[PDB]
A paper describes a structure:
Despite extensive efforts, we were unable to circumvent generation of this inappropriately matured form of the protein. Taken together, these results support assignment of S1_NC as an exo-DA2S carrageenan sulfatase that would likely have activity on any form of carrageenan having a non-reducing end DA2S residue (e.g., ι- or α-carrageenan).
The polysaccharides in red algae (Rhodophyta) are primarily mixed galactan agars such as agarose and carrageenan. Carrageenans are high molecular weight polymers having a linear backbone of repeating D-galactopyranose units (G) linked together by alternating α-1,3 and β-1,4 linkages. Furthermore, transcriptomics revealed upregulation of the CarPUL during growth on ι-carrageenan, while biochemical analysis of eight CarPUL-encoded enzymes revealed carrageenan-specific activity, thus associating the CarPUL with the ability of these pseudoalteromonads to liberate energy from carrageenan.
Residue numbers in the entry:
A (entry chain A), B (entry chain A), C (entry chain B), D (entry chain B): 36 to 507
Write the structure that this text describes.
């Protein structure tokens, strides 16, 4: 029974790290990437926390667990992942692992503790269950101030980017690191196998860091991508609507967007420091050499691509792609360019730990890819499936199928679907849904989507077959 | 088997008519009110079309029929009322009624015809089923024009109020009347009992009429109510959000709101003319003397009360109250001040027509009240129940319980409930939810709400018992 | 809030009493019949304990409560009525009744107590929930002895009829009476309204009584009915199979069947004594003059009609008909010949006691009939609906519709349905299902059955529409 | 896309063949066993046709497909496998296989044809769907004749064993072979990949063969096993009851049981001839060298072990074990002694044929075992899971877990479970369930069963946790 450590981050993009030729020097994450298996084409299940984390920890899609929206936020109907869904936490406990959890959970008050973990520290540790959804009255008021031409301290906009007072040592991130260190120190003194999860709120917006991280990337030198700040042409209406109050970006100057980037980059630099602190502790405690590690982001984050901020009900690569490194100390490092999914994390843990199966596995173990490289998937279609059933109480039913060359997005709450040619239009600027030159590609993607919905027993296949009847 | 005629209107308020001391002379509706049973405290089930109409025609709440949102609109998940829900239409057909339908249906393409009616004319008559939701790209563009300081013809704002070209004879309303006349003429030549439904889109916004109705009420002379144009204090966040694009009323001048009223009043005057035309035809065809008539609005309409336009996920009296007249030619006219519900229409039709029962009746027959007056309900609590599960793809789960003196609104997708003292604050300006002086009233209303949710087997009772635990 | 007493008996036939011109002098029950409302055409919902009692106490059919088989018996899948089904017991407790229960419950261990009653005494009072089904190894062994030509003490067959040692004072029946007396004496000392249920295992087989009841009816003088001991002609196979081990009656002589009658009659004589003891106690305690009383049998019992013993999956009148007397001290006594149902008991209690509604009422209040006589139902079809979904782990799906003149039984687990002309063949000897002279009656009964299944939302309507396609 | 032939037999035991050292010379089946992969410890999913065949063809357990009883038989509630369950038949058709079906289907009228196969010949081919259950009036009458001391032609008992008139050429088996030959001859003329299923009613009882098979095995020379004709000691009551009318074996002499063996052996001899005819046709048509073959029995058959005949709700090896040979022409022959399951057939077909996944796979592909031998399962628990939810309308909920050394049977409709030490008591004579010497084994098997029920999402896990509370 191997020791396992998961380092989970909130809205951490695939592309920022120096090992991906990104703009932030991340030597600790780069070292882990170089020692482990790089999943460079990893895709989340949903660009939203609770659905992505339920999928990650249960290995099933939201229509199977019922966890298909964020919990505890205006105006979601959901409060918690059912206690019948024990997840990898309870499964590991059942075969004698000591499981520990630190930080962001967002699957219901006390959840890790109710499933047998030591919930050492985090927002949800001492909360009562069935609480009222958090309703963003303060964010609403502050975005109205931004629209009225007000700014916060030092001309910042604290619903978007913020200099935190103090130092790294004062941060939530440092507290989570300190609890992670305690978790590792305690594990080293136990005869029981260890499964530890350290889950950081960073780099979730508003993009916030203390000095020196707040000023380490000059906003004036940020390279903005080809899809930055464009008017969306022939995109679905759900990309227009102000779902969360900060999604009104009408007041954002180019300077504001550049600062959103420079603060995000500072947050990634601070995350790199946090990862180094935990890896150094694992080494000092004699756990590192045999430690099976996953580093993953729950989804990405929009920094003004398509004039969007944060996240919402859509399928753009900046949100859909996630960073993923899986380090198995028994394997030679490899780079995997086959697409993989958040649904593949639970089966990988299941194979590592010989977890009992508690039900379906909607994904596949990544061990074959970690052992053999891309050739493990010889003869298989290179696809990923993404869902966006709900955004905080709004129903969308979104499904996307992504190949290396194309993406098809079904928006069943709209009349407008999306079709992107990722080979010629990797920035997803041009919706080709109405372009007859793409009839063969759309037909193929519709067939692949129907097959996936059938495989996972998604009840929206009935509606899909109506909407796409011309292509079946 | 009596002949039955339903005259159904879309967003027709309880209060406009001259028989209710309202500002519009409505002699044809007044005459029907004076000949029939006035339900002066009638309440809709939901301030939204498809849920209210499914409840009206099936006699069950949306959680039982599955019809708990509008159909066919961005971003609802629903397309049609299940064909397993035959409604009063199929039930009447099954015992030998000739059923006819004209006008607005909004329960799925071809629905009345699929349930055995002659669907003589209307939007949904020749539409394919399972169509894509109508997504309001044009309304979105036009509201952006209004926010940019543009206006339409003659300085109007055609997403709010509009002079139609031509005359009454050119209108959808006149076409629906003409088909209603044909329906009555045909019924008079048949030996079979008749059940006819004429369902008008009027007075649904934008508030539109031709001359002379467009100019018959001077906007300068409109009396605006105490809750007109106020800033909402301590109200739920769902009252703030721009659900449909025209809900952005930030560009509306007092003149614009006054014109919304004067065009609405013109629409009610035109409806009165339409009702007269159908009643005169019933008289000319020898059907009127034995004709059992229902005149009802599916819900009201907001004309700037609480600075709200049209409708949305809320429970204010201007939307929740509905006009209702039920004329049984065998009964002396009476005014009923006991509250009644949209759920009471199907059981009243069931008693009139001896319809077979196809399942639960969530309401009660109104015949006892029509026969005896208010004393029929001696010893019963005077309550009404209102739901707002969904608004066009947004989930809210709203429940309201209303007594003559108080209203309690549960907003389970928010942290803020509502409590109104209708005796001291009939305009519902002051939310008393946090006022300890109302602890007894809130406790009583919470107990009444729990009992109603139990009675109708609403699965949200579990969440209710958590949210309201302090008062149970 | 009136005081209510229910006297419930297990397998007590409609016809044994002297007030029904039956063979047993029952002066106490006759007196109650003469003082109350006689429902002389009452019908149980199912000829099996747990389903009948769940229907009685909840007012909903088994497909709605899930309680569609006996609990706790080989080889039923069921253990208890869900605690979400509070029944009239919890509903009465909720409005301030003191509810007390004595004797047979058979709806799950501790059930009356878990729903707020004082469970004073009875088999289920101190039992653990979720116990293993009682499997009749002893009965199996003893019926094998009977088939081998053995007899029990005094030549009796103790799986069919038995002389108990001692006297009435030593019996379970006397203990249940004594607890009933305590219940009434305690109720007389309280100002709180009283709801008491005394539920007797008598006269459930084996038919067992002490002297002098054991020898009170001479077996040689028993009048056997026209359908006694016949070979079943063209009847469904479920009437042939040995479901419970004592259903093998191949070893029964005519003397054994006569003695099963003698002992059944002795048990009815002892029941009449028990009823007298409780009514006399109510009189002595000053409760009788205002006491609202129901006396009912859960179903009948087969004494060799169609060569059947006890009960099983079938719909014969001797099992389907039930005794019912409802005494409302405010009403003149009347005889009701309209059919009524076990589903009508909960709504009658709900009207008497002003119980809150916890859901559907599949039956109707009997107060209108108790007040007006048969004319209350002028213009209603005189039908009863009977179900036999399960017998102790065997699935049958049986439905029967009964009119004063005809009975149609659907046996969906068989190829043979039943059709009886009760006018010309009240003993139900001749199955007319294939007789084209009865095509009009069968068609009418099929239509009535389809209507009833639709009304109660019985999911077997789909299969019914296949099986009866020729008749719809 | 390889060509696939399935040879399926009805109630064919694992042990009769000469390759298993059994009493019948079966050179054709032995040759296939010697050329292919022998699964000598194969286990069916249920000892009943429709459930076993639904599991075989869908790769999911009955609680997932709803196909958990025989269809079309007194007194099952079921008529057909849902057409939403396309099975391997529709999945193979979807990727361009020509699928053909001959013989016994027993999953609903027309089922193979409705799923895209050429249903060449068989009982279900031209039948109407939703027919009334076959009710065994003839068998009931004839078993009554046997109990009255009558015999059939030549002193036979035709509900148990029967000489057919004519020769092999006149048999149903020869017709099924002849259609199988046509299927192979037609497949040889197509370039399209072939998937053929030939499903024989033999050797289902009554055990029936023409000469010379009827007299080939001398009944006087039959070797009877150690568990033949014993009185069952401390066994569950469902083993005693006469579920199907021929289960009354009280009239069977030792000669009658010996002849049931003689005729069963004659039927296996005739099956070996049938298999030879199809394999020889495959060779003559040039298909054999690349033909991927499965030969399997749906379950075994009881020949008087524990004094049982045919099958019923129980888990004895003679019924639970099944013959299985899988021949992949690309692989070296191997004998597999690891247990395998009927749930492993669909995934094996899915791997051979690259079938799309239509949902869960409750089993595993057998290719790794076929390639590597038993070592493929190194470090896996050697278990099999068996269910007996229903027998022809009787509910039993039975679950069995089997290891090489032990078997635990949960009988939730009884108070008696079973525990067999297969090492010391391979004939399953001694129920050890109450033997404290076996507490460790029972505890381990209970844990393994709980894990399996959780893995397949069997809703009976809730009741299992109550019944087995002492052991969890
Ligand atoms: O596999 S595990 O994660 O160890 O958990 C299994 C099973 O998957 C899980 O559903 C169950 O959870 C039970 C279930 O819901 C909540 C919890 O207790 C309740 O009473 C229900 O039995 O726990 C099992 C392992 O115990
Ligand atoms: O009561 S009615 O309105 O006359 O309709 C009843 C019943 O309520 C309704 O559910 C049923 O509808 C059937 C059902 O769904 C659609 C329609 O056909 C399908 O095949 C199903 O049988 O119709 C009955 C009366 O026929
Ligand atoms: O109407 S009552 O008989 O008073 O009971 C109601 C309701 O009908 C009943 O379902 C509920 O039972 C709750 C329910 O299951 C058991 C009990 O507690 C659980 O937690 C569930 O909420 O009790 C109410 C009265 O409170
Ligand atoms: O995978 S397949 O065997 O090819 O079948 C799939 C799917 O698994 C199956 O459920 C579906 O069956 C549809 C479904 O029920 C019957 C049939 O038509 C109905 O309208 C429903 O949509 O068929 C697909 C292949 O198309
Ligand atoms: Ca996130
Ligand atoms: Ca921080
Ligand atoms: Ca599944
Ligand atoms: Ca599927
Ligand atoms: Ca409306
Ligand atoms: Ca109009
Ligand atoms: Ca209901
Ligand atoms: Ca309820
Ligand atoms: Ca009984
Ligand atoms: Ca007794
Ligand atoms: Ca119904
Ligand atoms: Ca079989
Ligand atoms: Ca044959
Ligand atoms: Ca599970």
């Amino acid at each position: 029974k191997p020791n396992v450590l998961i380092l989970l981050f909130d809205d951490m993009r695939f592309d920022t790290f120096s090992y991906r030729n990104g703009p932030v020097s991340t030597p600790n994450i780069d070292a882990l990437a170089n020692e482990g298996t790089r999943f460079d084409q990893a895709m989340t299940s949903t660009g939203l926390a609770s659905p992505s984390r339920a999928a990650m920890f249960t290995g099933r899609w939201g229509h199977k667990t019922g966890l298909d929206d964020n919990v505890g936020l205006y105006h979601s109907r959901l409060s918690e992942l059912s206690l019948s869904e024990g997840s990898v936490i309870k499964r590991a406990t059942s075969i004698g692992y000591d499981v520990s959890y630190v930080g962001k959970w967002h699957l219901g008050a006390q959840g890790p503790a109710l499933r047998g973990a030591n919930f050492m520290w985090g927002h949800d540790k001492d909360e009562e269950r069935n609480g009222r959804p958090f309703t963003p009255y303060q964010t609403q008021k502050n975005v109205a101030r931004m629209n009225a031409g007000e700014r916060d301290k030092n001309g910042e906009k604290h619903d978007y980017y913020k200099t935190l007072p103090g130092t790294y040592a004062d941060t939530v991130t440092a507290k989570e690191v300190n609890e992670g260190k305690l978790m590792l120190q305690n594990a080293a003194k136990s005869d029981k196998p260890f499964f530890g999860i350290v889950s950081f709120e960073q780099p979730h917006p508003p993009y916030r860091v203390p000095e020196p991280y707040a000023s380490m990337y000059d906003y004036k030198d940020i390279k903005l991508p080809k899809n930055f700040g464009i008017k969306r042409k022939h995109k679905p209406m759900a990309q227009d609507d102000i779902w969360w109050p900060w999604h009104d970006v009408s007041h954002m100057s180019e300077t504001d967007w550049r600062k959103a980037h420079s603060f995000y980059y500072g947050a990634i630099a601070m995350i790199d420091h946090a990862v180094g602190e935990l890896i150094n502790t694992a080494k000092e405690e004699g756990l590192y050499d045999d430690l099976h590690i996953i580093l993953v982001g729950d989804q990405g984050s929009m920094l003004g691509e398509h004039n969007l901020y944060d996240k919402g009900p859509y399928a753009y690569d900046e949100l859909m792609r996630m960073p993923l490194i899986i380090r198995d100390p028994s394997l030679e490092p490899k780079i995997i360019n086959r697409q993989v999914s958040m649904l593949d994390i639970a089966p990988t843990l299941r194979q590592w730990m010989t977890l009992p199966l508690d039900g379906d596995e909607d994904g596949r173990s990544l061990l074959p890819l970690m052992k053999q490289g891309d050739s493990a998937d010889a003869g298989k279609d290179d696809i990923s499936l993404y869902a966006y059933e709900w955004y905080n109480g709004g129903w969308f039913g979104i499904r996307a199928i992504r190949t290396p060359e194309m993406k098809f997005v079904w928006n069943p709450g709209d009349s407008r679907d999306e079709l992107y040619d990722l080979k010629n239009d990797p920035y997803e600027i041009t919706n080709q849904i109405d372009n007859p030159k793409y009839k063969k590609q759309l037909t193929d993607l519709v067939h692949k989507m129907a097959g996936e919905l059938n495989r996972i027993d998604d009840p929206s296949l009935t509606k899909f077959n109506h909407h796409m009847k011309a292509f079946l």
